[PDB]
Every structure is written in C-alpha cells, then in structure tokens.
Amino acid sequence: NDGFVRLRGLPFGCSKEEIVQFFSGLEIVPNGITLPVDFQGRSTGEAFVQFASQEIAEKALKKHKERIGHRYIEIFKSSRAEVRTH
Ligand SMILES: [Cl-]
Ligand SMILES: [Cl-]
Ligand SMILES: [Cl-]
Ligand code: NA
C-alpha cells in the first residue's frame, strides 16, 4: 500500500490545515503532505499526499475537482519514487 497521490491547482500558499480537511476522514501519515518550497510548484499548486494505505489513496482519488476556496483541486495517482525524484 504505497498510498501516494499528486495534487495540482492548490491555491498559492495553501496550508496543510486546508489540505488535511479537504481529505477529512482519509488518514494521512505523519508529515504525509509534501509541499514545493519553490515558486513554479507553488504557482502550479502541486503537492504530494501520502495516505496510510493504497485503499485510502484510492478513495482520495474520487475528490478530483472538489474545491479549496475558489480553486478546483486536481488529483492524480502517484508513487514513493515520484515524491522523492520530482
Ligand atoms: Cl507545515
Ligand atoms: Cl515562493
Ligand atoms: Cl466541491
Ligand atoms: Na503522479
């Protein structure tokens, strides 16, 4: 159970509080949200999220185009490999 997804479209400066609550009831591992510390990634609104299992990550994939504030959040399958080397 790798459990990784990739987000796109987050608001610039979107907080971890907003991302966790967007995924309310889908368990994220400790430090499971990886944010860009760079400007193009922040402008894209990229993040990676590591859920506690692939079964949980499969449920997260269904939230595609739900909102954080004004923005429609895009949700893609990902992997440990992609989080480490992106
Ligand atoms: Cl933080
Ligand atoms: Cl920045
Ligand atoms: Cl929505
Ligand atoms: Na991906």
Mind listing the domains of the chain with CATH numbers? 4-84 (3.30.70.330)
Identity at 51, one-letter amino acid code = F
Method for this entry: X-ray
Cα 23 to Cα 5, 7, 39: the distances in Å are 12, 12, 24
Q: What is the whole-number distance in angstroms between the Cα of residue 36 and the centre of ligand 2?
A: 9
Q: What are phi and psi of 4, to 5 degrees?
A: -100, 140
Pairwise CA distance, residues 9 & 44, whole Å: 6
Q: Please count the other Cβ atoms lying within 10 Å of the Cβ belonging to residue 18.
A: 14
Resolution (A): 1.1
Residues flanking ion ligand 2, Cβ below 5 Å: 39
Per the CB < 8 A criterion, the answer to whether 48 and 78 are in contact is yes
Per the CB < 8 A criterion, the answer to whether 56 and 5 are in contact is no
Q: What is the whole-number distance in angstroms between the Cα of residue 33 and the centre of ligand 1?
A: 9
Cα 61 to Cα 16, 23, 37, 38, 39: the distances in Å are 18, 10, 24, 25, 25
Stated as kind and residue range, the H or E segment containing 28 is: strand 28-34
